Design a protein that fits this description.
This is part of a larger assembly, with three copies of chain A, one copy of chain B (175 residues) and one copy of chain C (133 residues). With 496 residues, chain A is α/β, with parallel strands linked by helices. Chain A has ten helices and 22 strands. The longest helix of chain A is centred in the last third of the chain and has 18 residues. The N and C termini of chain A lie far apart (87 Å). Classes of the chains: A alpha/beta (496), B alpha+beta (175), C mainly beta (133). The interface between A and E is small, with 7 and 4 residues. Chain A: This is Tail sheath protein.
């Protein structure tokens, strides 16, 4: 900007990121190696910082990796690491190899997630199990389970304590009739030996997230008590006792149909994801993928539904298709009727070939209502987003009346005065509400009755009200989703 | 063979704040340049990230050929680049956003500046690096003016089908 | 007081186009006994043969005769600025307009100005107890 | 900035006290600014990996 | 809430986040420390600072 130039001098944005305004918070366990301080919100930059900042193969690192893989840009990320319980017990799994390889081949596994797969070629025929179990030298470090490579058996121990390490099912390619690169006479047995014991129960959200707004909360845990605390915090952010910090949370529940239905505690502030008992992918990865996709990476438009195979595709996750759908259709309908979210494969090849999952319905866990009447006012997650958007937009619009002279007793405004009265205020607001039809509201059933304005002098008794305080009451409906049409098909044989 | 078949590589790329920021009473501004990356035993190397952002800076921070005036210019600073006579795409390098002149009220001048900015960055679509570009400029007062430039990118591997337009060539930079 | 046909309040907000300057809503007073007129149906019918009609685009207009405010340049009241207006009759009706424009201004002596305004839509607030939704 | 306040004309009979001013003398008060020859703008740059 | 109801001025920042950047505060309410009355009867005649200026 010196020794040259002309009008229009430049000064540049030292920082290359400006998509601030929407934030995502990820909460999960960590390991000892992590250098990050516990119970302190911190900003995450990119994949380079990981591992060092949150330990190797920790629950938090895996969740963050998927979040960045889905939201490449347009959203800011935050993490809230948590430490293991005092007396946590790590789960243990056993994978024994038996037999002596007698033909040249290749052994390949699939555990937890596609990124952790492996493929090693058996050295040669007549290699016993001891020379086998070299799989351990091939397992990627990021796998949350530690392999020890014992004499003839390989033991997998969870790197994080608690119940978070009780989810596995292995798909495997020996003993099959595919002599394409299979070693003959080798088999593998999979079994569990020790489950997880204890999970943490932090209850200090009011201190570490005090008066900080977050668009989406993602929780990588399956403890019901932990989830219950998160729901309570969100309620407070939506409370009427103070300025609000609107937000939403994502959690998952796994088990049989009878167990999953027992977790439906009518929470409008959460979107519970239901999974079967034999899900071939680690649970918290799918939940993180769903949260990141909907964490304003797609939902900058409040009214966009994250469903279908075009918008609700968790492309970052790959998994082979099982021999059974998992959720029987009679059970899929029940879950959707009880406020749960159900996901399934996005392509029809149920053999063992790799596919991707997608989400059927973007529905919260809202049922019944204050009092006990049933309704679907907050059935769809979009309703919560639209409700928050309307509040902010309306508050901004009313700012123009801040510090404006108001006449209430004698309603004739003199010449040259700058002011307004109740009727003029109501007319202006009525204009604004009618204009937004098709953007934030549907057609009002009766626009003349759904908006009211009353000065505080007309509500409080004599000599108790305050000068210059109003009470505005508005009722609205979000844009209509769909419709039902009855079709009566009737062919006619008579010609007239 | 392995699915990683795209062998095209990426050369050096100018980056913002490469040489730090120059501070002054008016404000703080970046000083773009090349970036050096060091190893554990020396062996410095140049960074190659954010290709499109690097290309945008080169277009903006370079004076293009000046229009004829009838009085003339000195041969030293007629503008442009002498290497543009070999390219075959029928375009000229640089930008002309510094050639505006005070005309009418400040509102008119600012509007003209925006027009030139769009007319220069439009070259990005022509090369095929980005599928769309748009700049939003807001006037708030005498001394505070802002301008934000939006550049649209694409993923390395095609994923959607049935696009109205076309898949931009030279997308192997995936941005 | 509910059957008196007249105008009670008139507020106008100016937004200069060459400087983006905004002047808050200023009350105004009418120059003579004439009243403003309105047209809110933005479609025009023409008579075909045998009871058929034919629609056309048209606009919604307002004629607002007001007394110039001695603190605002005369140019603004003509086609050199945006206008937002509100008129409140005695019975209770309120008619609001935003993003209006002045068309074909005529010469004015300096005090009485008659403005013809056109806008995409004009909103109306009937007194309490309306029938239509 | 405000042409209605940057120019003022006053007769000498309004500045001097009674029976002290002269007939036919004025005072002109003016303020002006020369043409601007500069401008500064922020160039916030956002290369965004696509997400509609 | 308690401070405002007792005639005090409370200021707050314009933006909130953990980035640790710089922000400028603003006044919530412009209120004098006036309470009660010369006869010890509560009222709010001089609650607003603008009231004193208008009286002068």
């Amino acid at each position: 900007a010196l020794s040259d130039g002309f009008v229009r001098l430049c000064i540049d944005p030292s920082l290359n990121f400006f998509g601030e305004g929407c934030k995502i918070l990820v909460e999960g366990q960590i390991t000892d190696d992590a250098t990050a301080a516990e119970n302190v919100v911190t900003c995450v930059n990119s994949e380079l910082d990981l591992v060092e900042r949150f330990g190797q193969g920790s629950v938090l690192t895996e969740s963050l990796r998927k979040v960045f893989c889905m939201c490449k840009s347009g959203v800011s990320v935050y993490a809230l690491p948590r430490a293991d319980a005092a007396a946590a017990v790590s789960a243990v799994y056993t994978l024994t190899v038996t037999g002596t390889a007698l033909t040249d081949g290749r052994v390949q596994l699939y555990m937890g997630e596609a990124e952790y797969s492996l493929d090693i070629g058996v050295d040669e025929g007549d290699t016993p199990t001891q020379i086998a179990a070299k799989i351990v030298a091939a397992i990627s470090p990021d796998f949350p389970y530690e392999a020890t490579a014992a004499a003839g058996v390989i033991t997998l121990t969870a790197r994080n304590g608690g119940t978070i390490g009780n989810h596995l099912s292995v798909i495997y390619t020996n003993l099959g009739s595919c002599t394409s690169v299979t070693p003959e006479g080798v088999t593998v047995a999979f079994a569990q030996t020790t489950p997880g014991s204890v999970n943490p129960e932090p209850n200090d959200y009011a201190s570490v997230v005090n008066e900080c707004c977050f668009a989406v909360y993602v929780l990588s845990s399956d403890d019901t008590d932990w989830q219950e605390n998160l729901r309570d915090w969100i309620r407070s952010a939506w409370d009427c006792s103070k300025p609000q910090c609107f937000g939403h949370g994502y959690v998952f529940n796994k088990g049989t149909l009878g167990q999953v239905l027992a977790d439906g505690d009518n929470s409008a502030e959460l979107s519970r994801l239901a999974l079967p008992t034999t899900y071939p992918v680690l649970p918290y990865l799918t939940n993180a993928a769903y949260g990141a996709l909907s964490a304003c990476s797609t939902c900058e438009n409040p009214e966009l539904n994250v469903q279908g195979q075009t918008y609700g595709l968790l492309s970052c996750i790959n998994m082979p298709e099982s021999c059974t759908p998992g959720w029987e259709f009679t059970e899929v309908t029940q879950l959707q009727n009880n406020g749960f979210v159900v996901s399934g494969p996005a392509t029809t090849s149920g053999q063992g070939n790799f596919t991707s999952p997608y989400i059927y319905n973007d529905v919260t866990n809202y049922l019944r209502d204050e009092k006990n009447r049933p309704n679907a006012t907050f059935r769809d997650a979009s309703s919560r987003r639209l409700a928050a958007a309307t509040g902010v937009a309306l508050a901004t619009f009313l700012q123009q009346f801040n510090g404006l002279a108001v006449f209430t007793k004698n309603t004739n405004i003199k010449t040259g005065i700058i002011g307004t009265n109740l009727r003029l205020m109501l007319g202006k607001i009525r204009k604004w509400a009618s204009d937004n039809v098709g953007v934030l509201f549907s057609e009002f059933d009766n626009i003349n009755e759904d908006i009211q304005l009353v000065s505080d002098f007309d509500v409080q008794p004599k000599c108790v009200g305050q000068p210059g305080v109003f009470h505005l009451n508005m009722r609205y409906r979000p844009p209509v989703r769909g419709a039902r049409i009855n079709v009566n098909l009737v062919p006619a044989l008579f010609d007239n | 063979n392995f699915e990683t078949a795209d062998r095209r590589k990426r050369f050096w790329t100018t980056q913002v704040a490469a040489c730090g920021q120059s501070s002054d009473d008016c404000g703080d501004c970046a000083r773009p340049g090349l970036q050096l990356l060091c190893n554990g035993e020396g062996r410095i190397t140049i960074a190659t990230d954010n290709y499109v952002a690097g290309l945008a800076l080169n277009i903006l921070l370079t004076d293009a050929s000046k229009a004829d005036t009838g009085c003339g210019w000195t041969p030293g600073n007629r503008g442009g680049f002498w290497g543009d006579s070999f390219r075959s795409d029928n375009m000229r390098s640089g930008s002309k956003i510094r050639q505006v002149t005070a005309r009418g009220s400040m509102r008119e001048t600012v509007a003209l500046i925006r027009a030139y900015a769009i007319d220069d960055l439009k070259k990005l679509v022509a090369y095929g690096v980005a599928k769309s570009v748009d700049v939003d400029l807001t006037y708030q007062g005498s001394n505070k003016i802002d301008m934000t430039i939006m550049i649209q990118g694409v993923d390395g591997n095609e994923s959607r089908v049935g696009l109205t337009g076309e898949r931009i060539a030279n997308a192997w930079v995936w941005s | 007081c509910n059957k008196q046909n007249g105008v009670k309040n008139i507020l106008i907000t100016f937004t200069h186009c060459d400087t983006g300057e905004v002047i808050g809503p200023i009350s105004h007073e009418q120059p003579d006994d004439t009243l403003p007129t309105y047209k809110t149906c933005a479609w025009t019918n023409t008579a075909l043969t045998n009871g058929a009609v034919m629609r056309s685009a048209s606009n919604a207009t307002m004629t607002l005769p007001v007394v110039r405010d001695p603190r605002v340049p005369l140019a603004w009241y003509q086609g050199c600025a945006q206008i937002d207006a509100q008129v409140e009759k005695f019975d209770g009706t309120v008619m609001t307009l935003t993003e209006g424009a002045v068309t074909e201004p005529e010469e004015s002596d300096g005090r009485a100005v008659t403005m013809t305004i056109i806008a995409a839509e004009i909103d109306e607030l009937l007194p309490p107890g309306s029938l239509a939704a």
